[PDB]
Amino acid sequence: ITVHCDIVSAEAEIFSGLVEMVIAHGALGDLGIAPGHAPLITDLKPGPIRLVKQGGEQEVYYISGGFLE
Amino acid sequence: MNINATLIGQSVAFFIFVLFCMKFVWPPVIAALQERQKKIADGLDAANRAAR
Amino acid sequence: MNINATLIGQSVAFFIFVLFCMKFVWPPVIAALQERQKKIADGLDAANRAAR
Amino acid sequence: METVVGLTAIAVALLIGLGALGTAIGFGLLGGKFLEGAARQPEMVPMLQVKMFIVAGLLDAVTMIGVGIALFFTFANPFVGQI
Amino acid sequence: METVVGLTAIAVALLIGLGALGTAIGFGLLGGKFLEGAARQPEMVPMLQVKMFIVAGLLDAVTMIGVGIALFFTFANPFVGQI
Amino acid sequence: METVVGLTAIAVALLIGLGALGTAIGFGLLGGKFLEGAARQPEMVPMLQVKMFIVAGLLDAVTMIGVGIALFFTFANPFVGQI
Amino acid sequence: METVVGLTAIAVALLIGLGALGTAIGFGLLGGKFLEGAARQPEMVPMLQVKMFIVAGLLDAVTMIGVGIALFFTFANPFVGQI
Amino acid sequence: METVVGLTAIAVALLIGLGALGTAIGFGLLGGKFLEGAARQPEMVPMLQVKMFIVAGLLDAVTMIGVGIALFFTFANPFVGQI
Amino acid sequence: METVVGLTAIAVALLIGLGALGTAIGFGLLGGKFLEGAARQPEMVPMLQVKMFIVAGLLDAVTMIGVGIALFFTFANPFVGQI
Amino acid sequence: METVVGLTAIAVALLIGLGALGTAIGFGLLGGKFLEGAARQPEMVPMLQVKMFIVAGLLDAVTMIGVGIALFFTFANPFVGQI
Amino acid sequence: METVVGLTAIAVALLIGLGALGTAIGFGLLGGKFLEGAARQPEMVPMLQVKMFIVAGLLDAVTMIGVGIALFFTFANPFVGQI
Amino acid sequence: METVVGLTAIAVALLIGLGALGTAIGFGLLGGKFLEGAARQPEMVPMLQVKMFIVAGLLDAVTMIGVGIALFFTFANPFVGQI
Amino acid sequence: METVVGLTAIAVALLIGLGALGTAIGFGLLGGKFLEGAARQPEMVPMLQVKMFIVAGLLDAVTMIGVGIALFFTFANPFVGQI
Amino acid sequence: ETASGYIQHHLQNLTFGRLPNGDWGFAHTAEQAKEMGFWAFHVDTLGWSVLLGVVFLFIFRLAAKKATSGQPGGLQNFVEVMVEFVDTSVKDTFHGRNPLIAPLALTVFVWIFLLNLIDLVPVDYLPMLAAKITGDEHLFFRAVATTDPNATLGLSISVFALIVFYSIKVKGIGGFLGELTLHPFSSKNIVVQILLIPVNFLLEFVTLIAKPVSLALRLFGNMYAGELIFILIAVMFGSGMFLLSALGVALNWAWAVFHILIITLQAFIFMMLTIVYLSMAHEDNH
């Protein structure tokens, strides 16, 4: 029901914990990741990442682009 | 007779086609031809400036 | 007679026009392109030499 | 009557048969993309399902005319009155 | 008389049957890409829907001609008047 | 009667056979995308399996009408009575 | 007479029906790739729309020649005159 | 009886032949996606193999009805009893 | 003589119809790849457009050998002389 | 006697020919992805190969009934005794 | 003669029509990969072109053997000499 | 007698033509993936060739059966004796 | 004799038109993947071309048997000598 | 007259040949021309192809006999744009030193374009003008020369001669037969390369003889179908009706606007495949 998401940058950590769903703006279109998603490497657009924590809490960090692994 | 009507029908169709051709299809070609003539002339002027 | 000797009638006309074009139409026009490329090149070379 | 009535059974089979063939392949293509979109972003499913039903109307529109004409030639018959 | 009328019923079935087969396959190819684009870019779905209806008119142009000609053959056979 | 009856046997073969052909290709396209989506998101499989059965109902809709009319023409016959 | 007239009605369904099938699959293939580019690059839409109408002219070229020789066969008949 | 019996052999060949054609292409599409998923994630194979058999039942459903009707038309005959 | 004239109308319909079908599907494949390449990099559009027209000459070659022969079978007739 | 034996020669060519057409395309699809998986994961080729044979058995299942019935009609015709 | 000559016009329409269909789909598949290759490697365009014209000789060989035997059947006739 | 012999030439054409059509497309699909895999891992080419030949045996199996039953129908025809 | 010789002309079109259709689409698929591989690895082009011609032999093998048998049925006739 | 007679007259050529008694005379009927044997000439096709070839070279010579090498005048500006377009087309395909390839491509493109362009003028104007100037009412006269399979076959059989010529001239007689029998299926060992010479010959000969046929028939099929649709649209006016002579004018306009794109594209395809087929006869492509 949850996975260990870690939002990090070359300078410091942005978020670290347990999440239920991760919504990202990929280079080829939006993604919705949930527990047990298959291995995936992707280029991220500059925009807000929405995360859902168990339960109902919705983190909305703004990121200037990057890589989702 | 029917043969005379074929020449009239062909003639009006050819006139409206020639109108569309000379008023809208051909003018861009005149512009493309004259712009090359300008670009050639300006290059030769720059070569004359360098000689002076 | 009626259909195929036109295969050589058109072939002869084709080869004659190709040889005429190769000697009296293509060489006089391509030479003007070769000359202008040198006219512009000489201007750029003269400018660098004069500055130095 | 025999030639007109026998070739009308072939006509009815072509109308529903070519319609069934095209509709089944068309929904395999449309529906395969609905599942692909639903797997890319699970929260978009409510919108994608409504957009799929709009396309399903365009997809089956001509097949429904074909089924209607095939059931018209089965119970009534315009060709039998033409002789 | 029977061979002209009987072969007309099959001509009718071929026109609406081949049109039904092609439009259903074509709208699943077109609509399958409409759902893929909508799942990837949900803010663009209002634009993608209008661009899709412009391809829908091109995809159904020759098929609506066939449907009109098929109904004409059924309710006004133009061949029965040709002996 | 022998030509009407023999052409209803080909009508039945076309009507069930073209439906079988379309339904087998259609489910190969739908099912191949279901396996791709199920491998990508294992936690969404319960939802994707239910959504596949919605499409399966649209995919076979005209094929079931074709099988129903083909069984009607096999055990009963509207053409034998000349309509 | 009846064989030429009935076999020209089947020639019109093959001319307009086979062109209808091709034009519908061809525009689903070309418009699917247009809607894919308009989602990937929403700024190039105006340019891609023009380049799509150029290719549309090449797709619907032999189909309009066949839809026009098939209207020549329903309202005139070059075969009847040959007895 | 001769033409009804002769046309029942072709009816059986179309039922089994169109069913064999569709099922081979359908499993070629469903099968290629099972191997693709299995190569990317070899741990998922136990789940994907069970999900493939759920689709395989839907894919062959109408084809097996067609083979059942074709064996019935071969070892018995519902048309011959209608003269 | 009516068999030779009636079977020439079918030959013309098959010869133009199979060309209308192939050219519409063949350029809808090529046209989509041209739009996809244009979306990837719009700087190369002039060069890609020139290459597409060079393939348009290879793709429509044999379909024009059949449209010319078909329009030579509707007005002239090489089979009527052969009796 | 002659129409039943002539039409059963065509029934045998449809049963084997449609099965041969579908199985050759089906193995091209299935086998193409087997080589893609083997090139992506060289160490998994003995695992992917046993899974390919499980699908191969499903892909050819109906095709083997088709050739079985075709060779039965060729040496022990079941329709020649029904007239 | 009337059937041997009228069934040679259908023979000719299938030799040039099936070849026209396969070459327009084959050059639409080959060309779609040439336009993408021309985008992925703008400097390789002169090499990709010479290699595509080598494949083009293999792609049209059997089609061109058929446009020759069809022209040989339209202006000479190996079947009419056999009564 | 003439009908059986004439309809056995059509059976031979279908057994080899349908087989040739499927085999050509099947090797186009299989071989295309063999080139894709060989370009990605040029050191695994010895292994990919043997794996492609394993699949080639499956792909041509029913085509080889049909081409053996078509050279049997051509020389020492099995249906001529039956009548 | 006129029916055996007329049906033989049609068998030949199927034996060459189907082969033309199959090889043109097969080489479009094979060659399209050769240009895709040539664009990614221009160093591998001479190796890939040798592997492409190995596959080309498997793709046209049955098609050649078909055109060999087709020419045999035009300049000789195993059916005419069996009547 | 009737629509069948109107269409049948437009499809016959001005033939000149051996009548029952003498090798000097014009055929007065289609059948009087079919009786005549193999040694033949179409006086309307050879009268338009040669005249347009001379008019093209005369206008291009007027822009070459006074070439400036400096600032270009209006006429020579266009001729330089055509020469540079063709030179660029040849350099992006052919890497050798051959002096024939470029003037051949310029001649082929501009000449074929003019032979096709005359299709835009109304179809009954030239045939009736020729009849009025001659004093006859049954004169056969076809103006578009690329609608004659003989004109298009003569243009591709001459290009094929240049292909067999350059292939022997640079690869040698041994290299010509070598390409035709040792490629594409080149075996590593001698016992198998000899069981692949019958195969290599069929494939390379069908491909070599199909280049002349495909070049002639692609141009013939696109032009004969283009003029035939104009003749059928002219039959809409013969009806005398109003709602048919209005639809016919709209179809004639739409067809002429579409046909100029095809007239331009067919001249381009013939030039580019002539450049490609002559460039692949100078190097071993395998």
Ligand SMILES: [Zn+2]
């Ligand atoms: Zn070589």
